[PDB]
């Protein structure tokens, strides 16, 4: 997982350029509560 | 206007960048009086 | 590690447009953030502006404003600097120089300050 | 708005240790550059980041301090290093990165 800084918006249609990163030990304790996925069409089962 | 090369002046704003703290709390939605 | 080629000396006149460019023969265009350094003959250095390649944004010195366009080509690989309303003491050194800024293309851009990799100077004369 | 040099001339002699300082309005405390620039030379840069050298820098340049007021220390001054000492503030945003003035080192 990198850390990147040329970021689009998810606001509106942009591009946005933050600040270098933070000195030290960055901790994101999280929960995966979800998920989105997509599909694929067609076609003549299939899997 | 005019007609398909429309003027897509793609603008740009120089603000500061303080670096800042970040942590999401939980947020209720009320409905107002009479909803 | 880009060589910065400058464009040869030019003679002006007061109240002119020169357009000085900068080409940056070597590695990825994109990546390298570009700035004009002016210097008066036997003074110091005078920070004139920076452009920013891939954002294509570039920020100006207080004491130019209105008279300056750093624009650049990513096609030629090319840094164009041009003035206008030229006065008596724009007879000075111009400097184009880079710096690596990280893999602008996806992610990193370190917005460094610091001039690693300079041209060569070129004297532009207003007479 | 700010970027005066410590010193002014430094006519010394080679083996003695260099005295280069740099002085700045407000505080900076990590964004000071340091260059070396022989008259008709484009200038090398010695120390980023007031604390590190750059590719192909002696170990004789040591930069160091905090804050405003920073030092760069050339203890093995050679017959290469009578020059222009520039140093460059670049901690505001919106870039307005101001340079030093300069200090000469004739013999």
């Known amino acids: 997982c990198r850390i990147k800084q040329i970021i689009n918006m998810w606001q509106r249609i942009g591009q946005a350029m933050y600040a270098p990163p933070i000195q030290g030990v960055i901790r994101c304790v999280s929960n995966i509560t979800g998920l989105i996925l997509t599909r694929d069409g067609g076609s003549t089962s299939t899997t | 206007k005019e007609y398909r090369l429309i003027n897509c002046n793609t603008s740009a704003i120089t603000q500061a960048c303080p670096k800042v703290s970040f942590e999401p709390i939980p947020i209720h939605y009320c409905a107002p009086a009479g909803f | 590690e880009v060589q910065l080629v400058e464009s040869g000396a030019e003679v002006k006149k007061p109240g002119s447009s020169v357009k000085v460019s900068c080409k940056a023969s070597?590695?990825?265009?994109?990546?390298?953030?570009f700035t004009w350094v002016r210097q008066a003959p036997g003074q110091g250095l005078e920070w004139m502006g920076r452009?920013?390649?891939?954002?294509?944004?570039?920020h100006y010195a207080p004491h130019l404003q209105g008279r300056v366009t750093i624009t650049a080509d990513k096609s030629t690989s090319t840094v164009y600097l041009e003035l206008r309303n030229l006065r008596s003491d724009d007879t000075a050194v111009y400097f184009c120089?880079?710096?690596?800024?990280?893999?602008?293309?996806?992610?990193?851009?370190?917005?460094?300050?610091?001039?690693?990799?300079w041209g060569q100077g070129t004297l532009v004369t207003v007479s | 708005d700010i970027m005066t040099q410590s010193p002014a001339t430094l006519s010394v002699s080679p083996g003695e240790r260099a005295t280069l300082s740099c002085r700045a309005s407000?505080?900076?405390?990590?964004?000071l550059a340091w260059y070396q620039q022989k008259p008709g030379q484009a200038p090398r840069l010695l120390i980023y980041?007031?604390?590190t050298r750059a590719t192909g820098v002696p170990a004789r340049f040591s930069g160091s301090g905090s804050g405003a007021e920073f030092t760069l220390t050339i203890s093995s001054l050679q017959s290469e290093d009578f020059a222009v000492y520039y140093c460059?503030?670049?901690?505001?945003?919106?870039?307005?990165?101001?340079f030093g003035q300069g200090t000469r080192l004739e013999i």
């Open positions: 460059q503030q670049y901690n505001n945003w919106p870039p307005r990165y101001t």
């Open positions: 070597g590695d990825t265009f994109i990546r390298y953030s």
């Open positions: 452009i920013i390649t891939i954002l294509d944004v570039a």
């Open positions: 980041g007031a604390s």
């Open positions: 407000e505080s900076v405390s990590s964004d």
């Open positions: 120089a880079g710096v690596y800024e990280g893999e602008a293309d996806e992610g990193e851009y370190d917005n460094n300050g610091f001039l690693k990799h």
